[PDB]
Design a protein around this nucleic acid. Structure first.
Lengths: 170, 184, 270, 194, 47, 98, 130
RNA sequence: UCUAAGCGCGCACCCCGCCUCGCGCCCCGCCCGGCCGCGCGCCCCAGCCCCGUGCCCCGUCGCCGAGCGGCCCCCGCCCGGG
RNA sequence: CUUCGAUGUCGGCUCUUCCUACCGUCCGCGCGCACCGGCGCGGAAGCGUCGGAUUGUUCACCCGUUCAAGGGAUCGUGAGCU
RNA sequence: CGGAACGGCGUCGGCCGGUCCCGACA
């Protein structure tokens, strides 16, 4: 939900007075979880355990979200059988906002929680490049569709104590 | 914005009216009304075509537009040419005698397998039964509605059922031979 | 464990509760169906069982051993002294169930029917129907009320009372019975027919025919408190049984803990 | 409160009705034959036939009672949702009347509908629903024909009464220009908006 | 019996497919039995 | 009485504040007509309320204190704790000060 | 399914959310579930709102594709759509409903007394018209 | 292509009738009285035909009458025979 | 694990109820289903599943008939009996 | 919806290829 660029390096050593710096773009609810994910990765990808290294900077990158763009997410999730690879495309205003839509549709359909899924990459794809039809139909210049749920105006009836004189039309 | 839509074209002879999801179709052979309100469809007239358009076709709702288009067009065919479902009585040793009885409103089948039980099958309203003099031992069912003719015909075939035995060896009954849009 | 052998339960549980009958006399309950448009007819009568005779009849059942042969068969003579119509009752078909619109009683009620309304007629007040007779006796009250039945009533029945003086019975008071007018072309025709018989005797010969089948409703002979063997047809136990052989040995299993309605028990047999 | 049960889910409305009865609201439910039970009829009949199987083995008379009439089925549903052995709840069951059709003077009472508990809004098209009246004919009710024949008569009479009401209402509205105008000006224009 | 009439009758009675479990009659070209729901085993037997 | 022409807003005593385990017969849960959200209760908070004793016929006064839930129901305390035979009975929240 | 279609420029009366009671325009459609709505003259800051919170209105404003917020405001101002909708039956009720929301307990007391005068008056008017 | 919409037929099973009981209620007769209440469009939801309101004061000033509804009321034994 | 200041322990006899994992009858369907008769399978517990010789027997075994499924209820059933 | 090996053209979502305007005997 946030989007952070966590920078980190192993603690300086006599053999390596200057160690290599790693940068990771991590989407997470909070800075504390973002720094845990960064170290979950560096522990496996670069053999740098959290106690071995240090986080130079966790930097929240806020985004301007005034226009809808198609964000494609490649990820790996561990199911009841085992790890699988999946590419999901979501059209959303900001990359953090589309990561929320991806993790909402990964828990609902694939039953994978945030810590099971690891995101390989997030990259904005143009209308021509969309490979998924659920996102493609919206990308076309003009979309006219009836209101999908016009019966959802039953929020009005909870207030009414459900004692309306006539049955409301939709 | 997904909407599985199938459009047919209304025949000029037929005059078609749609109110809600109930379609009333009248041509030369007579008016047929069918109600498709069980299904959620955007039946749209105007021009000379009917578009069915089921919006948000998530699951088996994609099946609905073709089915309804076919049904409206089966109705348009019947109100013009009419549907005939010729049925041929088949017997080995026992001549089976079918006699049209209530002024083309019922059939009485006797001497089936030398069975004392006489079977009368009434037709669904608006379907006439006759015996094709030309084909011989054949019964021609003619009506505007395809499903009334077909229901009338399958009741005919369901009454004439050999009680046990091997159905593969003992084939005797009324079997629909020709199902077609022809001759009322 | 399994019962080990196959036997049917003794007795019909439909006829439970096997209690003395609380209705005053056998009551018709369901009347035959209307079949509107039939010849207008009355559906029932009250009679008193007189005895049995035995008749020799010629049988014409085809494909029977007794075809074209003579058969001695038992007969029951029911004395049926003429009943007299005393009222017209109309019942609407309501979503609750048949609901009585009204009973328009006769201008004059006979002493036999009137003696039913009191426990001891000689010492009684004799107040029943006193105002009603004055309200009627012009025919206006009977006809205006009868019209209400035509508009609302869907079922028309007639109250009729037996003549016990024409019977060798010691009753004196007369049984009142509702007999349904049936098979009318319309309810108004039923009311018109019903008024034709008002205050007038109806005979068993008019109500039924020879060869027709009738069903007789009555209260059975009483046998008093009776044990399981007579009341329910259970097998008497072996002679060696202590505390007697005329008993249902096992009234049930340990579980269900309570005794069940299905098990046979001693009580009224008639 | 008189609520038409036509088009209403059985459980969803019963829950509103139960809270009202416990809050002392004196409710009457009419047209209970036209209330809806969700699910395919075959399965709702099996569920309503399975309930009638459970009867006290020793004396069926002392055991659960299964009511064929739809109005009685609706009352038993609300009873499950009400503390009926307690006095607060037996006094709530007492203030409830369930009717099939609008029969005595329930017809002349003003009637209301609970929109949220109504089937159209509550269940998706293609859910499959049945009316309590047909489930009750199949479990034993014998008066379905009776409450149809009667309801037809009431609806015919209501149409005649409506046309009579329509002309009178035009005069009633036309005559509403007296101090009603002053109240209207000082109720809505006084910015209350009512 | 006429041979032409025999063919029509046998199409109704003999031509078919039978699931090996449901035993259900199935269409001449089938991949799954309707009643046995997807049983992929089916046959039919000539007299 | 003390209250004769007081305009009032209909309310209902819907039972004492409770848990399945314990009843706090000190506080009384009141559903006010026209209050459907916790935020709306603010208007009717601290206002005078009264329930008419069924036996006495004389009002028992009280004040609305804090909102019970998200549904607009409020918790109220009266000079004497209510009897419990007054559950479902109507309480009156007076528009005027006393 | 026949009129009132989710589309670019459709005026929407928000019925849930922080913007409850405020009109807006559907600038883009993210999906079936959500739309991007902006109300430059109506006080809604551009945000993505689930279509459930947006009741559709008959008026559709004429907007360019991707019209920003300032360009949307010039286009929204140019259209007579907002003004006609407030002259509508729904718009007339929305104005009355807005006044009803800002009512204190003292205001409510005056309202309920006035309502009683109408209830009694109607009986007096309808007793004359028998 | 028997199914997904839709439709037809369909088991000594099931449910109901018939039957056994039956709390209550009803009509009637005697009697003819008391008490209480005040309030109706219908249909449809993929036309929803213009919606997305209303009521929001059952004492809070409302209670006349009429009508449409409800409710209460009322109905002996001993003794003898079956 | 519960019961030893005691839950009467086998079988029969009697009588009730239940289960289905169905033997016959019902309804389908498949056969290496010509008929006749078998055999398999799905729904189906309404009814039937008996009379005897030997054994305390449950069981077993044989005879017979209108040809004869398997079980549960404190191994149902002892202030019911034997 | 205690529960398995196993089945499911029930419905959404993937993963990896082939045929694809060289429109998937003519």
């Amino acid at each position: 939900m946030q989007k952070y660029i966590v920078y980190g390096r192993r603690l300086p050593s006599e053999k390596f007075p200057e160690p290599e710096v790693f940068r990771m773009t991590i989407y997470a609810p909070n800075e504390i979880v973002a720094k845990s994910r960064f170290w979950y990765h560096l522990k496996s990808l670069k053999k740098i355990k959290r106690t071995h290294g240090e986080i130079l900077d966790c930097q929240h990158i806020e985004e301007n979200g005034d226009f809808v763009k198609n964000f494609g997410v490649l990820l790996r999730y561990r199911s009841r059988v085992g790890q699988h690879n999946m590419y999901r495309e979501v059209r959303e205003t900001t990359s953090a906002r589309a990561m929320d839509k991806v993790y909402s549709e990964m828990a609902g359909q694939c039953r994978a929680r945030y810590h099971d899924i690891q995101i390989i990459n997030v990259k904005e794809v143009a209308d021509e490049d969309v490979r998924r039809e659920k996102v493609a139909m919206f990308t076309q210049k003009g979309v006219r569709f009836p209101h999908p749920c016009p019966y959802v105006h039953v929020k009005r009836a909870a207030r009414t104590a459900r004692f309306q004189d006539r049955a409301p039309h939709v | 914005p997904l909407c599985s839509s199938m459009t047919i074209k209304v025949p000029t002879d037929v005059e078609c009216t749609i109110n809600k999801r109930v379609v009333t179709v009248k041509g030369k052979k007579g008016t047929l009304v069918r109600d498709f309100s069980h299904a959620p469809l955007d039946i749209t007239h105007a021009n000379d075509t009917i578009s069915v358009a089921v919006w948000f076709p998530r699951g088996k709702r994609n099946a609905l537009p073709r089915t309804i288009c076919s049904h409206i067009e089966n109705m348009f065919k019947g109100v013009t040419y009419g549907f005939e479902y010729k049925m041929r009585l088949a017997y080995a040793h026992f001549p089976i005698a079918a006699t049209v009885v209530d002024n083309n409103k019922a059939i009485e089948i006797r001497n089936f397998m030398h069975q004392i039980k006489t079977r009368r099958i009434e037709c669904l309203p608006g379907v006439t039964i006759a015996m094709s003099t030309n084909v011989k031992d054949e019964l021609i069912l003619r009506g505007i509605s395809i499903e009334d003719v077909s229901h009338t015909a399958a009741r005919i075939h369901e009454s004439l059922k050999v009680p046990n035995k091997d159905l593969r060896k003992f084939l005797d009954g009324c079997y629909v031979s020709s199902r077609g849009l022809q001759e009322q | 464990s399994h019962r080990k052998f196959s036997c049917c339960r003794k007795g019909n549980l439909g006829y439970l509760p096997r209690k003395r009958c609380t209705r005053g006399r056998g009551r018709c309950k369901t009347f035959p169906p209307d079949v509107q448009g039939a010849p207008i007819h009355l559906t029932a009568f009250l009679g008193y069982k007189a005895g049995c005779t035995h008749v020799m009849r010629f049988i014409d059942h085809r494909g029977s051993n007794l075809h074209n042969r003579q058969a001695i068969d038992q007969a029951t003579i029911i004395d049926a002294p003429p009943m007299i119509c005393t009222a017209i009752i109309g019942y609407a078909k309501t979503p609750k169930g048949l609901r009585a619109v009204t009973t328009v009683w006769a201008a004059h009620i006979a002493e036999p029917a009137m003696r039913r309304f009191y426990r001891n007629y000689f010492h009684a007040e004799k107040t029943a129907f006193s105002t009603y007779m004055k309200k009627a006796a012009d025919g206006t009250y009977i006809k205006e009320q009868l019209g209400r039945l035509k508009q609302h009533a869907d079922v028309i029945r007639i109250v009729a009372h037996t003549q016990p003086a024409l019977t060798p019975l010691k009753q004196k008071k007369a049984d009142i019975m509702e007999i349904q007018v049936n098979g009318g072309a319309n309810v108004a025709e039923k009311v018109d027919y019903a008024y034709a018989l008002m205050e007038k005797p109806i005979s068993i010969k008019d109500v039924f025919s020879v060869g027709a089948q009738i069903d007789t409703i009555s209260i059975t002979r009483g046998r008093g408190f009776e044990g399981v063997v007579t009341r329910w047809g259970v097998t008497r136990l072996p002679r060696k049984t202590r505390r007697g052989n005329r008993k249902v040995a096992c009234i049930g299993a340990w579980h269900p803990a309570n005794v069940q309605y299905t098990v046979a028990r001693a009580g009224q047999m008639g | 409160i008189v609520i038409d049960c036509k088009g209403h889910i059985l459980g969803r409305l019963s829950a509103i009705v139960a809270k009202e009865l416990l809050h002392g609201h004196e409710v009457a439910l009419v047209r209970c034959e036209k209330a809806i039970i969700s699910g395919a009829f075959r399965d709702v009949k099996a569920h309503y036939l399975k309930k009638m199987h459970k009867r006290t083995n020793f004396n069926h008379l002392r055991g659960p009672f299964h009511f064929r009439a739809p109005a009685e089925i609706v009352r038993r549903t609300i009873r499950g949702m009400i503390p009926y052995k307690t006095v607060r709840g037996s006094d709530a069951m007492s203030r409830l009347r369930v009717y099939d059709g609008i029969p005595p003077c329930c017809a002349r009472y003003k009637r209301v509908v609970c929109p949220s508990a109504m089937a159209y809004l509550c269940l998706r098209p293609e859910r499959r629903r049945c009316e309590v009246g047909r489930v009750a004919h199949e479990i034993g009710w014998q008066h379905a024909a009776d409450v149809e024949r009667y309801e037809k008569r009431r609806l015919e009479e209501c149409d005649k009464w409506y046309q009579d009401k329509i002309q009178i209402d035009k005069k009633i509205a036309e005559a509403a220009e007296k101090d009603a105008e002053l109240q209207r000006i000082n109720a809505e224009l006084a910015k209350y908006g009512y | 019996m006429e041979p032409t009439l025999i063919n029509l009758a046998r199409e109704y009675n003999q031509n078919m497919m039978i699931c090996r479990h449901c035993y259900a009659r199935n269409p001449l070209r089938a991949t799954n039995c309707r009643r046995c729901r997807g049983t992929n085993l089916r046959k039919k037997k000539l007299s | 009485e003390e209250i004769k022409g007081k305009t009032f807003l209909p309310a209902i005593f819907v039972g004492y504040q409770r848990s399945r385990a314990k009843q706090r017969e000190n506080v009384a849960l009141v559903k006010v007509s026209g209050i459907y959200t916790r935020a709306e209760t603010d208007k009717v908070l601290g206002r005078l309320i009264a329930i008419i004793h069924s036996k006495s016929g004389k009002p028992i006064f009280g004040k609305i204190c804090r909102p019970h839930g998200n549904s607009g129901m409020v918790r109220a305390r009266f000079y004497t704790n209510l009897p419990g035979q007054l559950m479902g009975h109507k309480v009156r929240v007076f528009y005027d000060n006393i | 399914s026949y009129h009132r279609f989710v589309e670019a420029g459709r005026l929407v009366y928000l019925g849930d959310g922080p913007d409850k009671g405020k009109l807006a325009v559907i600038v883009d459609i993210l999906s079936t579930a959500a739309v991007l709505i902006d109300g430059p003259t109506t006080g809604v800051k551009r945000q993505v709102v689930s279509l459930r919170w947006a009741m559709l209105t008959d008026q559709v404003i004429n907007i360019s594709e991707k019209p920003t917020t300032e360009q949307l405001k010039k286009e929204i101002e140019a259209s007579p759509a907002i003004d006609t909708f407030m002259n509508s039956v729904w718009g007339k009720k929305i104005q009355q409903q807005r006044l009803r929301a800002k009512a204190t307990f003292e205001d409510m007391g005056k309202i309920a007394k006035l309502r009683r005068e109408r209830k009694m008056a109607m009986k007096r008017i309808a007793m004359s018209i028998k």
